């Protein structure tokens, strides 16, 4: 009766007290790791979780990565979703996706040198797939617009990690966090000399990748195939987005092996400023024109 009402009201008062304070921070979700077929990035994501496993799972994987930061020391598990290799697995990925996952939507990608031109193409394929999922989501367009506004504000909030918008900026106006990495990074020297490919072509590819990022919204990432550059920093930016960690690392531009351009680290003009070195690489040259593939 009223005694139970009072006891449960005390329960609710303490519940409000705990909810106002003991909420700690965000957890659970992780980014859309758009793992592609034949990526070989199983161990890459494993080292991202600090592990080493090339176990080809049931297509995709709802991988686990807890995170306890001693300021709170509460392990924040990550709903790591490394995308599969089957285009048939699209619905399962959607089945893996969720409306709340849409509320906690973040994206992830990498880039291996071997079919890096096709990695642009496969990235386009995965982006179209993500758009297809978003269409399949069919969410509240007002809530979608508000979330897009928040994401655009965050993009505008990209200050120095140390209004006027580009036409291609956020062209893939997904409205979710996006990540792009650089796989097979140890092979660039083999690509540049052993494969004798132009390092100017490599730079132009990086520029076109940055352009695709400007379309999308994924910052450039320092990464090493063997040395695993900035993987801790990768998780750091990940927490800065999701867990809201106090990101502090300055961006890196000069080092190609550790090319981490964060959000706002280069404008479209700064992309064009980076495009100044593309002398032999004409701006009208195709990525197919900048592609290499033997039919062996």
């Amino acid at each position: 009766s009223e005694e139970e009402e009072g006891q449960s009201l005390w329960s609710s008062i303490l519940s409000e007290v705990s909810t106002r304070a003991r909420s700690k921070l965000p957890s659970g979700k992780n980014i859309l790791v758009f793992g592609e077929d034949g990526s070989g990035k199983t161990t890459l994501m494993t080292k991202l979780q600090g592990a080493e496993h090339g176990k080809k799972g049931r297509g995709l994987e709802y991988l686990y990565l807890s995170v306890h930061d001693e300021d709170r020391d509460d392990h924040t598990r990550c709903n790591v979703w490394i995308l599969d290799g089957d285009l048939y697995h699209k619905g399962l990925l959607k089945f893996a996706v969720s409306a709340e996952s849409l509320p906690e939507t973040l994206v992830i990608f990498v880039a291996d040198m071997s079919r890096p031109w096709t990695v642009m193409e496969s990235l386009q394929k995965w982006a179209s797939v993500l758009r297809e999922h978003i269409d399949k989501m069919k969410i509240p367009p007002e809530k979608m617009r508000e979330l897009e506004r928040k994401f655009v504000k965050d993009f505008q909030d990209y200050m120095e990690p140390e209004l006027p918008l580009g036409d291609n900026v956020l062209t893939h106006n997904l409205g979710i966090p996006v990540l792009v990495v650089c796989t097979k990074c140890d092979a660039v020297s083999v690509l540049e000399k052993e494969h004798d490919y132009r390092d100017e072509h490599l730079d132009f590819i990086q520029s076109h990748l940055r352009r695709f990022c400007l379309q999308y919204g994924a910052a450039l990432i320092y990464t090493s195939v063997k040395e695993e550059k900035n993987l801790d920093l990768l998780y750091k930016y990940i927490v800065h987005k999701t867990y809201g960690f106090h990101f502090t690392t300055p961006a890196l531009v000069v080092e190609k092996d550790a090319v981490f351009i964060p959000a706002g680290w280069d404008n479209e003009k700064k992309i064009a400023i980076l495009h100044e070195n593309f002398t032999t690489v004409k701006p009208e040259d195709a990525y197919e024109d900048f592609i290499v593939k033997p039919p062996v």
């Binding site: 009072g6 006891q7 005390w10 659970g28 176990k55 049931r58 994987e61 709802y62 399962l92």
Partner: protein, 223 residues
């Protein structure tokens, strides 16, 4: 194999077997972090399902290439192992999709039971001084507190603990045992606090009655 995994969720036939779920609580600063963690249980269930699928997937591909020679090895997914049959599934992707969906459903049921358990997290969360301040020394407040403590005790009838959450049998036994201990402790602490409040009220009432009786005995009303 998809049908068999579906049965496991629910000579060619076979029969798989899996362990039970790691049901538990925690004491992290007296904080009930379930043992194993829910994310850990979901990942372990994913690992078990992946093992069940890799039972089929471990089949090597048709090694007819030994007749050929000259080129470097081409042990692809479907080349070395049985990989392309995943795409070539005759029932379509519905089997693996339903497996993932059933895993999600089991995880949702685990989450529901876990929320039910964690509804007692405020039992550890109880700020007793703030509770005493909010309730106050109202005699009706004390009576309602006693009734509410009785009701809370009545809502804690624990006989069986290990609520088997399907194939991941939830080991709710020890968690429920620690929870019953914590509920008894909360009830006893409420009994002690209400005893203190009621003793103060009874002492105040006795003092007031003694003062009135002494006033009547010293100064007679019919003086």
């Amino acid at each position: 194999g998809l049908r068999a995994w579906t049965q496991v969720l629910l000579k060619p036939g076979g029969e798989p077997k899996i362990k039970n779920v790691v049901h538990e609580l925690r004491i992290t600063n007296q904080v009930i972090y379930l043992n194993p963690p829910i994310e850990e249980c979901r990942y372990k269930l994913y690992q078990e399902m992946f093992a069940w699928k890799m039972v089929v997937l471990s089949l090597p591909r048709i090694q007819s290439q030994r007749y050929q020679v000259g080129v470097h090895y081409e042990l692809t997914e479907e080349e070395k192992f049985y990989r392309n049959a995943l795409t070539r599934m005759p029932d379509g992707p519905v089997a693996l999709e339903e497996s993932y969906s059933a895993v999600m459903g089991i995880v949702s049921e685990v989450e529901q039971y876990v929320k039910v358990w964690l509804q007692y997290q405020c039992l550890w969360d109880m700020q007793a001084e703030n509770i005493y301040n909010r309730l106050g020394e109202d005699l009706n407040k004390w009576q309602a507190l006693l009734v509410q403590i009785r009701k809370a005790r009545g809502t804690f009838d624990n006989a069986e603990t290990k609520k088997e959450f399907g194939p991941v049998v939830i080991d709710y036994g020890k968690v429920q045992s620690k929870v019953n201990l914590k509920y008894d402790s909360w009830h006893k602490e409420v009994l002690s606090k209400f005893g203190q409040m009621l003793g103060s009220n009874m002492t105040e009432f006795h003092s007031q009655i003694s003062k009135s009786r002494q006033e009547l005995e010293q100064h007679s009303v019919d003086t």
